[PDB]
A paper describes a structure:
The resulting depletion of the essential metabolite NAD(P)+ lends to the killing of the infected cell (abortive infection) as a means to prevent the spread of the invading DNA to the remaining bacterial cell population. The SPARTA system was first discovered in 20186 and further characterized by Koopal et al3 in 2022, who showed in an elegant set of studies that the short p-Ago of SPARTA associates with a TIR-APAZ protein to form a catalytically inactive heterodimer with 1:1 stoichiometry. However, upon guide (g) RNA and target (t) ssDNA binding, four heterodimers transition to an oligomer (a tetramer of heterodimers) that unleashes the NAD(P)ase activity of the TIR domain for abortive infection.
To see what the structure of SPARTA looks like in absence of gRNA/tDNA, we obtained crystals of Apo SPARTA that diffracted to 2.66 Å resolution and belonged to space group P6522 with unit cell dimensions a = b = 197.18 Å, c = 183.4 Å, α = β = 90°, γ = 120° with one SPARTA heterodimer in the crystallographic asymmetric unit. We solved the structure by molecular replacement using an AlphaFold13 model of the heterodimer, followed by manual building. The crystal structure of Apo SPARTA heterodimer reveals an extended TIR-APAZ protein interacting extensively with the more compactly folded short pAgo (MID-PIWI) protein. The TIR (residues 1 to 138) and APAZ (residues 161 to 420) domains connect via an extended linker (residues 139 to 160) and subtend a concave surface against which the MID (residues 1 to 269) and PIWI (residues 270 to 507) domains dock. The TIR domain makes contacts exclusively with the MID domain, whereas the APAZ domain makes contacts mostly with the PIWI domain and few contacts with the MID domain. This interface between TIR-APAZ and short pAgo is extensive (burying ~ 2240 Å2) and underlies the stability of the Apo SPARTA heterodimer in solution. A unique feature of the SPARTA MID domain is “insert57” found between α5 and α7, composed of a long helix (α6) and two short helices, that extends outwards from the body of the MID domain. Intriguingly, in Apo SPARTA, the positively charged pocket on PIWIA that mediates oligomerization is masked by negatively charged residues Asp306 and Asp309 on the loop.
Numbering used by the authors:
A (entry chain B): 2 to 39, 45 to 353, 355 to 386, 388 to 432
B (entry chain C): 1 to 507
The structure:
């Protein structure tokens, strides 16, 4: 006896229908709309016995939709069977509605203009409702919020679904048993770059921190031949990772710091004797593959170098070690370009172009390229790093993986294409 | 396998006591939190600029759709959203003539160019503000495209178009002191040289210079390009729009409206659920490269409570920078001074002292400045210092599909540091918030003690108070979102004594 019916074409006028239904409900009116539910007999019964005002959305798609016209015909019969001169209230929302396309049953009535302002249209609809004494309850925007959250945001919520994720943290399985400090003292020249040695070594305080041996630097440091290896301080790496080691000579945070500083140099050196080229960044180094290498530019059917417009893109990696909370090597992914597949463009170009190329890649592609690169420069199921003549570190080519309790339903309709088209 | 937690998306409160996760939907269904009755628009620019502004004002009356209205929700219209009217009937127009622009835009130096044009706009704004009363809410600076192109740093004007010459070079301009002689004709040209040289103390970008030189007058300004409001009419040599807004028009309308609505005095929304007494302080540093001292830099603080109408405190200049480690740290004095400024402002606003004080920064605090912070901190007020970095190499890839990880997932390293996925997939929009794979921000309670999960929740909620951008959520909290903007505005005038001011005067 007091419901407000809204006939509309779906999904052409879904936005306006949702807006008007929710606003009228929050204002206190009781509206009936198929958009608020999750069958023709029900519609017929409602228009005939429960609808006080029948609103029809007048658009180009509504006046030709067959179901909307069926509901309008039922509404015409009903209107005839009462006395309501205003039982049918069209809502003109389409400024592209040609006059010759309006249905005859709508063109003979006066509609409410929503084309110039939805606010003005709503004010006019509410004025007509007030003058017609249409029943309504005091405002309840909480019900409008509830319907918005449970009907329209139904298939758009986060669900409790366990989801596993791969990461860029590749763990280090094998560690040299002892991290050593060699008291070279006068045997190490004061003005010598401890960054040129074949094995990663860095200064601490009169000592030299390294995983390599006492005499692993003889060819470059002659005086170290007179050094007694017993003067070296060897610390258990397992006691450094587990936090068991902490003295006045050196502290655990410092220990782990020198260990990552050695791991980074070990990666940089191992990259030298490998089938990769280099790219210098602000402080680190990235590594890529030339165009001529690999079978048709694909490792395990993964394009690692390819063509963009007038240049060639190359996927690249950079490495940085960390050992808290777990000892891993974090690999960052980058893109670097060449003109012919070998020689870099030294400029902006390599930025703009990176942005413009990477926008086309998504989760699948980035993950595939990172894992494929990592598996390419592997040496087995891992990547050996030489921190000494007989010591080494092993980084698994399978990354540390996480898992969560809340995931989402993947939208099969890939809107990533629409997003990546936005290249303005 | 390491385990992640999920932080439920915080809610923002709108009109009629309703809470939601998307500000566009909450504004459309219910309306703005605060309510105003009309936007009295002040317009500075050419007559064509006024025409473009009036055309956009007429356009936003009707609905404006996006391409994919699920990712970017539609715009029902200004009156149908804010319950207000932004009519062209109430436009106080102060005309900038075309010959006025030609008089000052064709100088060989970029600094004098930008200074003269910023002055031309600012004098109109301030004169209309003072003389004929303060009757407008926001001043809309309609910038022509030529000004925007040539009034920027590292922008060269063709020598053939130059009409007025330069008198002093950039290297000697900042050292030029005008000292008079007893030759009048000589002193005139010396004064002209000084007039040119003084502009090199300001930053040669129209936007920051205009907003900074307008700080001492406290006048809300929304700077819109002519090509932003009429992008269909700004084409290239191929007859195609340079800036293509065709698929996001509605979103554009959502951004210009909301921002304007905030500058006109109304607050569109605030945080739905936050503990009383909390106060968030985002540090801001900007190196003053003009000064010879490599450590010289300007400092500032942005205070936020439960809404996006934050407060900006300008600090002093000093050697806050350490070229060595590349981290800015404040000296004891300025730490005390800035924190006292912020706490006294909080006491003036809330008539009490904050129960907690979260200091947000991109670097780790040193003990020297943290002890100075503790000195002024009341006592029974928990004061901690959080580090948000973003530059932490951890990426989580979904094992299958092109869609990335969902926003809200968090990896807690320990009781003091965690990883937060402010970006990623969001089920509401059924799309992503960032291109490629999202990089989670890293959070660390560097100095102080507090719950890690509560700090994470507070940051995630703080990614929702952006009034300029009318979007679902931001990537970083508002405490650091506009740090570079505030920093550059503070170093663009180099002649300011600004008091504590609201965000709408920098934002
Ligand atoms: O028909 C009708 C269209 C559908 C979206 C906007 N207006
Ligand atoms: O539909 C959709 C939301 C609800 C009204 C307009 N925008
Ligand atoms: O109020 C009103 C209710 C809610 C949906 C159907 N009618
Ligand atoms: O226009 C208008 C139409 C003419 C007949 C009644 N309503
Ligand atoms: O080159 C370029 C890299 C890609 C990621 C960030 N910077
Ligand atoms: O604002 C305005 C409110 C929203 C629903 C109808 N009245
Ligand atoms: O400016 C310009 C581009 C067009 C859409 C987004 N920003
Ligand atoms: Mn210049
Ligand atoms: Mn602005």
């Amino acid at each position: 006896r007091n419901k407000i019916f809204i006939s509309h074409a779906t999904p052409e006028d879904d936005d306006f229908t949702r807006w008007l239904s929710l606003k009228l409900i929050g204002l206190g009116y009781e509206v009936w709309c198929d958009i608020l539910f999750l069958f023709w007999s029900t519609i017929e019964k409602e228009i005939r016995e429960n609808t006080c005002k029948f609103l029809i959305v007048s658009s180009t798609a509504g006046n030709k939709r067959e179901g909307v016209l069926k509901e309008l015909a039922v509404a015409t019969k009903v209107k005839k069977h009462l006395q309501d001169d205003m039982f049918i209230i069209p809502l003109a929302i389409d400024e592209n509605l040609s006059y010759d396309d309006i249905n005859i049953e709508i063109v003979r009535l006066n509609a409410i203009d929503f084309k110039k302002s939805w606010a003005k249209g709503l004010q006019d609809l509410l004025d007509a409702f007030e003058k017609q004494n249409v029943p309504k309850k005091p405002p309840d925007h909480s019900k409008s919020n509830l319907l918005y959250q449970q009907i329209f945001l139904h298939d758009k919520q986060a669900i409790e679904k366990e989801e596993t994720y791969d990461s860029n943290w590749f763990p280090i399985i094998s560690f040299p048993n002892e991290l050593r400090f060699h008291r070279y003292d006068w045997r190490l020249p004061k003005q010598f770059d401890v960054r040129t040695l074949a094995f990663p070594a860095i200064r601490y305080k009169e000592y030299l921190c390294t995983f390599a041996w006492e005499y692993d630097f003889i060819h470059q440091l002659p005086k170290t031949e007179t050094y007694n290896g017993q003067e070296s301080i060897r610390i258990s790496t397992s006691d450094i990772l587990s936090g068991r080691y902490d003295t006045d000579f050196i502290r655990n945070y410092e220990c782990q710091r020198l260990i990552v500083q050695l791991i980074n140099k070990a990666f940089e050196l191992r990259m030298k004797d490998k089938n990769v080229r280099e790219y210098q960044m602000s402080k680190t180094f990235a590594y890529w593959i030339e165009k001529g290498k690999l079978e048709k530019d694909k490792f395990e059917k993964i394009k690692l170098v390819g063509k963009q417009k007038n240049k060639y893109w190359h996927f690249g990696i950079s490495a940085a070690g960390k050992l808290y909370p777990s000892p891993v090597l974090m690999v960052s992914s980058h893109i670097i370009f060449t003109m012919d597949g070998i020689n870099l463009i030294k400029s902006s170009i390599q930025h703009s172009s990176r942005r413009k190329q990477g926008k086309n890649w998504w989760n699948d592609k980035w993950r595939e390229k990172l894992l494929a690169f990592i598996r390419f420069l592997s040496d087995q199921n891992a990547i050996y790093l030489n921190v000494g003549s007989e010591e080494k570190i092993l980084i698994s080519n399978k990354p540390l993986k996480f898992f969560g309790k809340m995931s989402y339903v993947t939208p099969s309709e890939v809107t990533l294409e629409e997003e990546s088209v936005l290249a303005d | 396998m390491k385990e992640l937690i999920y932080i439920e998306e915080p809610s923002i409160l709108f009109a009629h006591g309703q809470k939601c996760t998307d500000p566009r939907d909450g504004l459309a269904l219910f309306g703005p939190l605060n309510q105003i009755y009309g936007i009295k628009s002040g317009v500075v620019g050419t007559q064509k600029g006024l025409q473009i502004f009036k055309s956009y004002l007429d356009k936003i009356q009707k609905p404006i759709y996006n391409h994919n209205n699920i990712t970017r929700p539609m715009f029902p219209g200004f009156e149908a959203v804010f319950g207000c009217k932004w009519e062209s009937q109430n436009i106080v127009f102060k005309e900038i003539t075309d010959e006025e622009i030609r008089r000052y835009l064709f100088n060989a130096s970029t600094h004098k160019r930008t200074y003269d044009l910023v002055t031309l706009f600012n004098d109109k704004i301030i004169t209309a503000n003072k003389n004929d009363e303060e009757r407008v809410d926001v001043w809309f600076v309609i910038v022509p495209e030529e000004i925007y192109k040539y009034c920027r740093p590292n922008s060269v004007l063709p020598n053939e178009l130059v009409q007025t010459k330069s008198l002093i070079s950039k290297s000697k301009a900042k050292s030029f002191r005008y000292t008079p002689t007893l030759f009048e004709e000589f002193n005139k040209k010396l004064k002209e040289v000084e007039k040119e040289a003084k502009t090199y103390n300001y930053d040669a970008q129209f936007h920051d210079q205009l907003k900074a030189r307008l700080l001492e007058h406290t006048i809300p300004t929304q700077i819109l390009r002519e090509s932003t409001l009429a992008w269909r009419d700004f084409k290239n040599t191929f007859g195609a729009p340079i800036r293509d807004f065709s698929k996001i028009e509605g979103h554009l309308a959502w951004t210009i409206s909301t921002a304007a609505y905030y500058k006109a005095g109304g607050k569109p929304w605030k945080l739905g659920d936050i503990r009383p007494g909390v106060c968030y302080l985002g540090l801001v540093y900007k190196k003053i490269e003009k000064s010879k001292n490599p450590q010289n830099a300007c400092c500032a603080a942005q205070m936020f409570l439960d809404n996006g109408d934050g407060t900006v405190f300008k600090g002093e200049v000093g050697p806050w920078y350490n070229p060595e480690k590349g981290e800015y740290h404040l000296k004891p004095k300025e730490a005390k001074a800035l924190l006292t400024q912020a706490l006294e402002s909080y006491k003036e606003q809330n008539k009490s002292y904050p129960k907690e004080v979260f200091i947000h920064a991109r670097t780790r605090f040193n003990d020297e400045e943290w002890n100075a912070f503790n000195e002024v901190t009341p006592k029974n007020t928990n004061l901690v210092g959080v580090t948000i970095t973003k530059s932490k190499p951890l990426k989580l890839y979904k094992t299958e599909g092109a869609f990335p990880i969902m926003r809200g997932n968090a990896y807690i390293v320990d009781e003091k540091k965690a990883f937060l996925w402010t970006l990623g997939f969001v089920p509401k929009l059924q799309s992503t918030l960032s291109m490629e794979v999202p990089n989670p921000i890293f959070i660390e309670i560097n100095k102080g003690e507090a719950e890690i999960q509560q700090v994470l929740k507070d940051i995630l909620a703080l990614t929702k108070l952006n009034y300029n951008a009318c979007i679902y959520a931001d990537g970083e909290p508002v405490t650091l979102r506009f740090a570079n903007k505030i920093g550059e505005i503070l170093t663009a005038s180099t002649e300011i004594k600004t008091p504590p001011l609201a965000f709408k005067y920098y934002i």
